[PDB]
Amino acid sequence: PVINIEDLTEKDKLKMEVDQLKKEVTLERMLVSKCCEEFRDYVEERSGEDPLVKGIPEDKNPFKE
Amino acid sequence: FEGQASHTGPKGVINDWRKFKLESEFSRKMSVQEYELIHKDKEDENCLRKYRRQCMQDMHQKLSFGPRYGFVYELESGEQFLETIEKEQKITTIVVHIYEDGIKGCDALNSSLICLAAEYPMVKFCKIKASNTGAGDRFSSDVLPTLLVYKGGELLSNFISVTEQLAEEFFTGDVESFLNEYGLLPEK
Amino acid sequence: SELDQLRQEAEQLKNQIRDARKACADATLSQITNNIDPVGRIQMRTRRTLRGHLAKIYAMHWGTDSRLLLSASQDGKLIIWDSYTTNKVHAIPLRSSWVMTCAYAPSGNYVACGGLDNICSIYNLKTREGNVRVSRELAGHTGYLSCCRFLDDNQIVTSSGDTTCALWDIETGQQTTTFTGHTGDVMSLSLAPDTRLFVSGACDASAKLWDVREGMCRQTFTGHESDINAICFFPNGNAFATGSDDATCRLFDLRADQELMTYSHDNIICGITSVSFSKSGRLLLAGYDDFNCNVWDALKADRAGVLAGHDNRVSCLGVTDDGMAVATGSWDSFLKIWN
Ligand SMILES: C/C=C(\C)CC/C=C(\C)CCC=C(C)C
Numbered sequence: 123p124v125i126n127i128e129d130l131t132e133k134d135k136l137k138m139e140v141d142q143l144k145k146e147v148t149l150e151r152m153l154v155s156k157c158c159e160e161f162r163d164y165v166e167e168r169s170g171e172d173p174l175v176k177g178i179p180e181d182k183n184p185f186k187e
Numbered sequence: 188f189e190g191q192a193s194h195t196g197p198k199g200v201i202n203d204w205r206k207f208k209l210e211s212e213f214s215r216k217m218s219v220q221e222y223e224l225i226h227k228d229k230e231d232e233n234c235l236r237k238y239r240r241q242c243m244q245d246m247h248q249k250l251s252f253g254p255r256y257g258f259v260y261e262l263e264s265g266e267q268f269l270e271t272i273e274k275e276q277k278i279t280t281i282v283v284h285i286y287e288d289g290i291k292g293c294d295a296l297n298s299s300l301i302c303l304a305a306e307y308p309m310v311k312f313c314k315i316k317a318s319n320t321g322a323g324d325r326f327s328s329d330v331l332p333t334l335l336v337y338k339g340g341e342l343l344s345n346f347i348s349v350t351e352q353l354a355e356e357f358f359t360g361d362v363e364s365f366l367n368e369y370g371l372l373p374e375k
Numbered sequence: 376s377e378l379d380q381l382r383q384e385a386e387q388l389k390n391q392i393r394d395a396r397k398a399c400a401d402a403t404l405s406q407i408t409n410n411i412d413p414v415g416r417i418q419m420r421t422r423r424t425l426r427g428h429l430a431k432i433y434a435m436h437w438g439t440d441s442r443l444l445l446s447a448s449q450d451g452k453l454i455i456w457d458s459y460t461t462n463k464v465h466a467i468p469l470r471s472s473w474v475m476t477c478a479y480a481p482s483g484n485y486v487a488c489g490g491l492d493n494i495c496s497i498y499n500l501k502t503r504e505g506n507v508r509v510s511r512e513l514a515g516h517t518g519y520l521s522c523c524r525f526l527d528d529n530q531i532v533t534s535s536g537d538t539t540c541a542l543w544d545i546e547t548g549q550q551t552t553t554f555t556g557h558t559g560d561v562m563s564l565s566l567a568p569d570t571r572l573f574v575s576g577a578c579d580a581s582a583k584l585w586d587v588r589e590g591m592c593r594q595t596f597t598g599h600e601s602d603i604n605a606i607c608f609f610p611n612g613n614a615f616a617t618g619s620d621d622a623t624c625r626l627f628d629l630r631a632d633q634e635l636m637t638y639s640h641d642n643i644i645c646g647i648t649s650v651s652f653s654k655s656g657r658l659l660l661a662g663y664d665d666f667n668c669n670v671w672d673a674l675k676a677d678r679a680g681v682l683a684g685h686d687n688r689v690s691c692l693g694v695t696d697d698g699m700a701v702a703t704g705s706w707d708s709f710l711k712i713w714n
Pocket residue numbers: 370424682683686688689703704705707709710711
């Protein structure tokens with residue numbers, strides 16, 4: 123955790139790498155399509171209120187003339 | 188440019204620093220030697236001023252493209268339109284004005300453009316009657332005056348009824364201001 | 376200790392990982408959104424112009440209030456602006472002109488910056504004895520400070536050219552946690568909305584998600600064939616966008632542990648250095664090395680518009696928390712607010 127980089131050896135760097143990789147192999151990966159669906163839904167639900175997409179009426183635009 | 192970032196962000200800073208110490212004096216981007224140097228060189232404030240100044244001037248100069256035009260060119264057919272936007276230097280901004288004589292704003296805009304074109308000879312200003320675009324019935328009176336701005340084949344902006352977003356009685360300066368507030372006009 | 380065997384195991388592990396991803400890579404975002412109508416042509420306009428800096432703007436960062444913003448410039452000055460009235464609230468002389476980043480505390484109490492000086496300087500804004508000199512100077516990184524983001528008044532995370540990222544305890548100036556993992560200069564970092572996690576992009580073509588509280592790397596994302604210069608977390612915290620030298624913006628989803636979409640076009644050849652999402656996350660604004668900015672449609676993977684009409688004058692950019700505006704910096708010392 124509180125590691126000083128310049129002091130590590132080629133070996134224990136690979137050790138930390140493999141340790142990290144082992145941990146990453148056990149990752150519960152979700153299906154891309156599913157994730158894309160959720161991404162789309164989230165965006166679509168809020169896209170209609172997005173100031174930068176819909177535009178800001180001069181009336182409520184904080185950056186007046 | 189082309190390739191590795193060296194003009195913006197961290198890398199931009201790195202390269203700028205290098206150019207500084209060159210003009211006055213893979214996985215890793217900086218060499219150990221360069222690092223030691225930053226922790227050893229006492230930068231002269233005066234040189235810093237001159238550098239900052241010169242850098243902005245270099246960019247100003249690299250973006251200033253020679254005066255090649257100065258007039259509002261008339262496009263007879265939609266073909267001339269396609270040809271002008273494609274057969275043109277990618278660095279040249281093109282401002283096309285689809286219009287129709289007698290329509291509110293169309294005439295006023297055309298007048299302003301005449302002078303705007305003279306003010307910005309680096310920008311190619313073109314005009315074309317809606318009847319001459321040949322685009323079915325897309326560019327109609329409810330859309331006119333339309334102002335399209337292209338650059339390197341890319342459509343930067345498409346303004347519908349541009350005049351409605353200008354003063355009742357506008358002039359060259361107004362169109363100038365409008366386009367400047369969109370970064371569509373180069374510098375003088 | 377046999378290196379060959381260790382690095383060999385690493386490869387087989389990496390092989391196992393890629394396959395797992397491929398098994399899940401059954402479709403692309405574009406397909407899922409092929410029925411979503413494209414957003415109207417995004418044509419933002421300049422509202423405010425911040426005049427003050429005497430040189431090229433390197434970085435800028437919005438404050439939680441979406442009003443006050445900070446901007447680090449080559450002129451060796453950190454300025455806190457009032458976007459609403461273009462007025463200068465604070466002017467802070469820096470010890471170096473080479474500032475790579477500048478953070479703004481979510482409380483507005485502090486502001487930070489760092490660069491080729493390898494130190495993350497912190498300044499106190501709200502005080503009887505106002506601070507313009509320095510409160511703390513987080514020294515430790517053996518490489519330039521590329522990015523930093525405040526967690527609170529006492530903690531801040533910093534990425535560096537020394538291949539490391541780190542969490543610091545401002546009060547002590549000590550490096551609480553050091554995030555090791557990248558094999559190249561870390562170029563950017565972005566905190567998750569809940570600050571418990573944060574992702575970082577580096578010159579090793581990989582983005583790493585780290586658990587702040589645990590001090591270790593959770594997941595490592597790959598895809599770019601070049602250094603990742605910028606990275607920005609998505610509002611819901613389940614994904615993030617990256618920008619690299621290969622001229623492509625990529626959207627990585629945490630759960631999927633891979634890219635859902637890629638953003639590019641044959642005409643685009645400049646490396647991406649700035650990336651920011653809109654409030655709804657519908658737009659992915661990307662600043663390129665040619666000082667241009669493209670407003671991408673995160674969903675349809677097509678570009679919705681051009682920010683700053685390709686005037687070759689965008690060195691940095693950022694979106695307000697309320698999504699009411701986009702601020703841009705330039706090499707000509709000026710900053711502009713768009714919406
Ligand atoms: C009114 C114009 C100026 C005072 C100089 C130009 C200002 C800038 C270039 C700010 C950078 C923003 C852009 C994306 C153009």
